[PDB]
Amino acid sequence: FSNFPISEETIKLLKGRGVTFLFPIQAKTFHHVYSGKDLIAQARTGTGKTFSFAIPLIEKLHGELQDRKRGRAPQVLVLAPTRELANQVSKDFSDITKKLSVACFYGGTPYGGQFERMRNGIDILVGTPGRIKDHIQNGKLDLTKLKHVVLDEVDQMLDMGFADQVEEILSVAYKKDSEDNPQTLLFSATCPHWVFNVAKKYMKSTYEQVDLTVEHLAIKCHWTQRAAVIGDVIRVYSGHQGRTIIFCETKKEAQELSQNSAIKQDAQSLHGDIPQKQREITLKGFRNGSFGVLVATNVAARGLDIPEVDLVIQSSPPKDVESYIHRSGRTGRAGRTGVCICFYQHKEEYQLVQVEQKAGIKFKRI
Ligand SMILES: Nc1ncnc2c1ncn2[C@@H]1O[C@H](COP(=O)(O)O)[C@@H](O)[C@H]1O
């Protein structure tokens, strides 16, 4: 915890909860929270949202700790949508502070126990909007002495219809336009319109906000039409004076394809079953413009000097992903965007996702 001003006492209590270092949401918000800045945080479940406000709030409060006076008003108000979530936030506070009085006020429980806690004095108050609004009406609860307000799981509170109850509580604790109002920490995962209306009505003018080359095409094609569609994509992306390299896994398929009526007239084959003398000649032919289509096998190309192309075609999702990405970087001539086409069948659909994941690319599925 070296980067942060967390006391040795708090560090020891934190190790009991299995906290030895801060999660990203915590490290990013700590100083905004500690320094008293207003904040809107967007974070998913399990990211450690509770400690991102609890740890810096407890540290700030511990540093300004004035004698525990009976009947004291809360300094912190945490609004939570449910009893279950309010009890977890309370426990999280209680487990890392042995100096501050932590109260949990939810509805559908006797008022007596809560009135007693209010008389003894509260430092940190966690509660559901209903019960907090009740004790405001009673007069018994004083929320005009607040330094900090946390609106936890805002989305859930809105989905449950607590918008108007929260706005009522906010109207008591906040003065419209005051730069002296409590510090507001808003926790909304999706940030609906209500969040930005609350921010411009109750929050400070300035607030922090924290969140948490080649075209690759994939064509679904039945093997019986592949050669016809190959002729069509060449016509479109390569055309006249163009260069296309087709990659076929088997030496048979590559030979069969270079001889297919759709491309045969402008194509030449290249594989392991062709002499080194024929290979250097076909490479010269491709490089000088004797033919525009070079049909090859993924392995029989590995160390070969292939010129810049306009279009790369894989007959099926490649096994050899590094050969695919290397050849992809040599596509696109005269400032035109390079095009890599990948043909696939329904059985090869997850294979496409594997290529996407290994290569760090996303295919346009057509
Ligand atoms: N820095 C941390 N190290 C270890 N566990 C943590 C840390 N921050 C939060 N947690 C735990 O992660 C879980 C999810 O946190 P939360 O989303 O706040 O409920 C809880 O069980 C926390 O106790």
Numbering used by the authors: 188 to 399, 410 to 563
From the paper:
RNA helicase DDX21 plays vital roles in ribosomal RNA biogenesis, transcription, and the regulation of host innate immunity during virus infection. DDX21 is composed of three domains, including the N‐terminal domain, the middle D1 and D2 domain, and the C‐terminal foldase domain. In summary, here we reported multiple sets of crystal structures of RNA helicase DDX21 either in ligand‐free (DDX21‐apo) or in complex with AMP (DDX21‐AMP), ADP (DDX21‐ADP), or a nonhydrolyzable ATP analog (AMPPNP) and a 15‐nucleotide poly(U) ssRNA (DDX21‐AMPPNP‐U15), corresponding to different unwinding states (except for DDX21‐AMP). We elucidated the conformational rearrangements upon the ATP and ssRNA binding during the dsRNA unwinding cycle, and described an RNA unwinding machinery including one wedge helix, one sensor motif V, and the DEVD box.
Moreover, crystal structure of DDX21 with an ADP molecule was solved at 2.7 Å; however, one internal loop was disordered (residues Ile400 – Ile409), and the ADP molecule for crystallization was spontaneously hydrolyzed into AMP. Further SDS‐PAGE analysis of the DDX21‐AMP crystals indicated that the missing loop was degraded.
